[PDB]
Known about the structure:
The complex is a heterotrimer.
Chain A: no helix or strand
Chain B: E1 6-11, E2 21-30, E3 36-41, E4 44-45, E5 50-51, E6 55-56, E7 62-70, E8 78-83, E9 91-94
Antiparallel strand pairs in B: 1-2, 2-7, 3-4, 3-8, 5-7, 6-7, 8-9
Chain C: E1 3-12, E2 21-28, E3 31-37, E4 46-47, H1 57-84, E5 94-103, E6 109-118, E7 121-126, E8 133-135, H2 138-149, H3 152-161, H4 163-174, E9 186-193, E10 198-208, E11 214-219, E12 222-224, E13 228-230, E14 234-235, E15 241-250, E16 257-262, E17 270-272
Antiparallel strand pairs in C: 1-2, 1-5, 2-3, 3-4, 5-6, 6-7, 7-8, 9-10, 10-15, 11-12, 11-16, 13-15, 14-15, 16-17
Amino acid sequence: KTFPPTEPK
Amino acid sequence: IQRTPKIQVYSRHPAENGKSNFLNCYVSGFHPSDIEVDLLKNGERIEKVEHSDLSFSKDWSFYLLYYTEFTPTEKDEYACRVNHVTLSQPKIVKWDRDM
Amino acid sequence: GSHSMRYFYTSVSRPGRGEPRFIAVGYVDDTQFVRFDSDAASQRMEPRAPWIEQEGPEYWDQETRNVKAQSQTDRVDLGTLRGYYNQSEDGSHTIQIMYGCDVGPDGRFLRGYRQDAYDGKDYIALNEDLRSWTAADMAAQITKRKWEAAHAAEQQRAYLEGRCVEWLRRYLENGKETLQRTDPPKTHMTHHPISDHEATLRCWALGFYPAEITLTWQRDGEDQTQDTELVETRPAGDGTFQKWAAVVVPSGEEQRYTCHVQHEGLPKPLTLRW
């Protein structure tokens, strides 16, 4: 299963 | 900024004329991702060619495997053709049964 | 005995549309098992290995939701980075992200990774300790400060040591005939006379997994690297890999040259000659 969305750059 | 594709063309199993096999073209080390890859039979594009999904190495260069079922014969010549922004003309690599 | 799960994301902006191309690929070990491609009609995470079809619909909803949101984050990030770098709206640019977990033979967490790139160069990466970031440039230093404020390292580490290992273990139990297992190399030598006086010896390793392998030549007991060629390890297409190493030698003197093959699937390195 994937990690949730990365924190915005 | 841009990296030219490396190409290997080869069979899944050691070739035997008349025995079905898989023909692979492994393209790696390239950037950016947009690319054209085709397997050729006697200079003509093979229509039923599958490929893996886009992934990349730790240096960020992309790689893909293109592959198709085939039966080697004596008469037929096989090759892989690659086009990419880094290339002045398409690169065509002939298949050699011991490489 | 050792295993890994990895995800790879690539977003490529389009000077024509807007919606960048987003491709996400999941691996267990070296097997792609799920993919999402924003170009595709499904707009769903899709199975790419037989053993992942055993996952329920709860699964595919959670995964599709996540990667779609990631694609949206990447779209904003492409704009943010265009701004950091003072770049025009007209060029295509690429963000790449990979992360994943490794487990040892006992199935316990061994190491984790997370690294992000812009235009094919390092941008920001999680350190080996999983507690701090390395920023390649001044723009990524801004990102690092943002991520320090939002505890992004702690969130990534918790996934890497937890849910990543948990689901990797679950997928390994889902895979059976389809999950590639350790497979030692099948070896053979070919021999091609070149001239009245030289010949090529080519040492082949086929059908092996994992892809890590070492082929070396020795001449009369000592390593030989001059007059050798080695192709990069390549996938056979069936889960196994291939590699060869060649040496040019005086014709008739092949008995002095031994191929040594090292691979995790071998109890002892193999040696072979023509």
